[PDB]
């Protein structure tokens, strides 16, 4: 009966069987990674069916299957929301995960704990599915914290390295700052709407006040690495390249945008929070593209690209276009994951070398990676009729024709130009020059795992935008009529960014050298934000934690007040009372005094 619900639950359920088998004999053999990869491919194929059902009709469902508990008038149950967002995001995430697992089967071949690594990836995928399909705020919080814990465990994969542990703790810290706002929103909704269920929250909030929406915006900024809480995402490149391609590129970091999308009925009734979201996204995308423009580590360039794309998603949310933001999430998944896989292929082929100064002519040396990265860069810059076109071009048009900040619009356009610029930088410094790697050439692409994993996402990043856009129902009023110059603005700024970046990169061949300018130093050191904010606050916290809380108060003054004063007074009184010479002279004189006092005082 209605196979929709059975199929949707079966996908998530069969995602969990290898976790159960992780204690069986298969986990101790070398067939476990293929086991997990096959399970994920089967789950993707199964999840393709409810998407077809929704595409045909528009099937939507709520499944509240297990009743957890009841606090008087509040009923908490295990509920799944199988709506457009869930049934569209699950296939994309499963497809990307299947590609990444096939890639990791080649990339992490010499890692002793590859079974554990695969197991960790599956655990993250399960937690992310829990996050995406949740219907109440408690289940969503479960997924929210699960993905963060998996991120901590996978960033610090090489636990003997101090930097990996530092980066993992940094990610935990920033996401805890966001968790503060998540908890604020949960408390507000419980106190005012008497529910964590989404349906009652939508019913009872026709004009949502500022506090819950500001809490949700704080949580989204924390988990999607917006400008205030941004540096942890570039720091998270300490993990293995498959981790960077799966979690911190396309699937886990879009969780804040997803949270803002889930609560869009309440967001459109508030104009202040919309403006705050717009400004935050605009400043994030500009700042991160500006930082990316001068980076030399290729993974850092791609991570800053991801951060700028997330800022663009938040801009789209701010102009009241949530479905456009969801579409952009879906397209970015494909092409950003494939870009990270190409970067990891280069890194592995060059003996774990990540600096673009030390990779030269790779256009001919490794052609498949070259074509894949070229197609991915064209999709990222919004080349027409490619996957990124159908989201980025529409987003730019919507921001152009809207009642919004002029500054935010200008920053979005400049960020688009900078996106073209850093794509040019990657291509120019990784593929076009003469070789600059060590003489022992170990370049090799000929592994079927790598080729097939890259090729599936190549086909995706070519055709998925067209297919998905033509197969979904209209969810907004189109921008049919536009000035001709306004219609071409995205293409114009992309071409200008391409041309300026190419012209500036071609001058690196000239035989002249000069010291850098202040603007370059600002862009290279990430606006000095990681320096100051990772040295001034932390120090001033830790110092206080030792000087005042621990030493001055706990070890000195709290000790001085109650126990030490009591000891001192009792010891002094004991010395006063017991220090008597034993002469009956003074004793009997005192007896006379007390006799007189009792005679003349108590009567």
């Amino acid at each position: 009966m209605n196979p929709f619900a059975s199929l949707t639950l079966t996908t998530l359920t069969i995602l969990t069987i290898p976790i159960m088998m992780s204690n069986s004999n298969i986990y101790k053999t070398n067939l476990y990674p293929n086991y997990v990869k096959t399970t994920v491919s089967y789950a993707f194929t199964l999840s393709l069916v409810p998407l077809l059902m929704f595409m045909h009709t528009g099937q939507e469902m709520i499944i509240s299957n297990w009743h957890w508990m009841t606090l008087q008038t509040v009923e908490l149950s295990l509920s799944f929301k199988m709506d457009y967002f869930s049934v569209m995001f699950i296939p994309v995430a499963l497809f990307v995960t299947w590609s990444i697992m096939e890639f990791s089967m080649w990339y992490m071949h010499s890692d002793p704990f590859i079974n554990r690594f695969f197991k960790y990836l599956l655990l993250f995928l399960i937690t992310m599915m829990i996050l995406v399909t949740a219907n109440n705020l408690f289940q969503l919080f479960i997924g929210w914290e699960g993905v963060g814990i998996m991120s901590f465990l996978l960033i610090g994969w090489w636990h003997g390295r101090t930097d990996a542990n530092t980066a993992a703790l940094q990610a935990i810290l920033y996401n805890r700052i966001g968790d503060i706002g998540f908890v604020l929103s949960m408390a507000w909704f419980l106190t005012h709407s008497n529910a964590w269920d989404l349906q009652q929250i939508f019913m009872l909030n026709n004009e949502c006040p500022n506090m819950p929406l500001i809490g949700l915006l704080l949580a989204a900024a924390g988990k999607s690495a917006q400008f205030g809480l941004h540096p942890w995402l570039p720091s998270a490149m300490e993990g293995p390249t498959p981790v960077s391609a799966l979690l911190h590129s396309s699937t886990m970091v879009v969780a804040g945008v997803f949270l803002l999308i889930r609560f869009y009925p309440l967001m459109e009734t508030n104009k202040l929070v919309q403006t705050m979201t717009l400004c935050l996204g605009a400043i994030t995308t500009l700042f991160t593209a500006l930082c990316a423009i001068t980076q030399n580590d290729i993974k850092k360039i791609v991570a800053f690209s991801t951060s700028s794309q997330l800022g663009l998603m938040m801009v789209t949310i701010g102009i009241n276009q949530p479905h456009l933001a969801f579409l952009h999430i879906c397209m970015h998944a494909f092409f950003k994951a494939m870009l990270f896989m190409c970067s990891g292929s280069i890194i592995h082929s060059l003996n774990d070398e990540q600096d673009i100064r030390k990779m030269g002519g790779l256009y001919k040396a490794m052609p498949f990676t070259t074509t894949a990265l070229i197609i991915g860069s064209l999709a990222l810059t919004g080349m027409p009729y490619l996957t990124g076109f159908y989201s980025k071009d529409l987003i730019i048009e919507a921001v152009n024709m809207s009642y919004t900040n002029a500054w935010a619009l200008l920053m979005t356009l400049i960020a688009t130009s900078l996106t073209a610029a850093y794509s040019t930088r990657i291509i120019f410094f990784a593929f076009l020059g003469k070789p600059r790697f060590p003489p022992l050439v170990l370049i090799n692409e000929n592994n079927p795992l790598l080729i097939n994993s890259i090729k599936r996402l190549l086909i995706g990043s070519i055709f998925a935008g067209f297919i998905i856009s033509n197969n979904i129902p209209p969810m907004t009023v189109p921008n049919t009529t536009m000035p001709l110059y306004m219609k071409m603005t995205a293409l114009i700024v992309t071409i200008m960014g391409f041309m300026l970046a190419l012209e500036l990169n071609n001058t690196t061949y000239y035989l002249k050298f000069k010291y850098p300018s202040q603007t370059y130093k600002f862009s290279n050191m990430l606006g000095y934000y990681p320096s100051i904010m990772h040295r001034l606050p932390t120090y001033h916290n830790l110092s206080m934690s030792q000087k005042s809380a621990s030493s001055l108060l706990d070890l000195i003054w709290l000790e001085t007040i109650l126990p030490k004063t009591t000891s001192f007074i009792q010891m002094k009184m004991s010395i006063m009372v017991s220090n008597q010479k034993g002469l009956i002279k003074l004793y009997f004189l005192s007896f006379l005094i007390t006799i007189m006092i009792s005679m003349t005082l108590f009567n």
């Binding site: 009966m1 619900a5 059975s6 079966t10 089967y42 469902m61 499944i63």
Partner: protein, 103 residues
């Protein structure tokens, strides 16, 4: 500059010892002495045990236990357009107001 003779000699002795130690880290052809003791096909069994059995269990659980309670599985109402007909009742939704069509 360069090594002092004592430093040179200590380095040669230490590196000879280290090379011997590293050579002693190799395994003989019989070294992993394993003790034995016991007590489309693969795709078919995988599809049977990892897809069919879970879907059977989940469909049974949903069809006979979850839906036994009200409001557990709540469906979005299907969309109705003019000119459609309903299976349950059989009436025909009237068409629209014949808007003036041009371009």
């Amino acid at each position: 500059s360069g090594y002092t003779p004592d430093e040179k000699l200590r380095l040669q002795q230490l590196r000879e010892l280290r090379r011997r130690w590293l050579k002693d880290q190799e395994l003989s052809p019989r070294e992993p002495v394993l003790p034995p003791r016991r007590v489309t096909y693969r795709h078919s069994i995988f599809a049977v045990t990892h897809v069919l059995i879970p879907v059977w269990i989940i469909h049974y659980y949903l069809k006979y236990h979850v839906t036994a309670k009200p409001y557990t599985v709540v469906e979005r109402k299907p969309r109705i357009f003019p000119g459609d007909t309903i299976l349950e009742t059989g009436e025909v939704i009237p068409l629209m107001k014949e808007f003036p069509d041009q371009h």
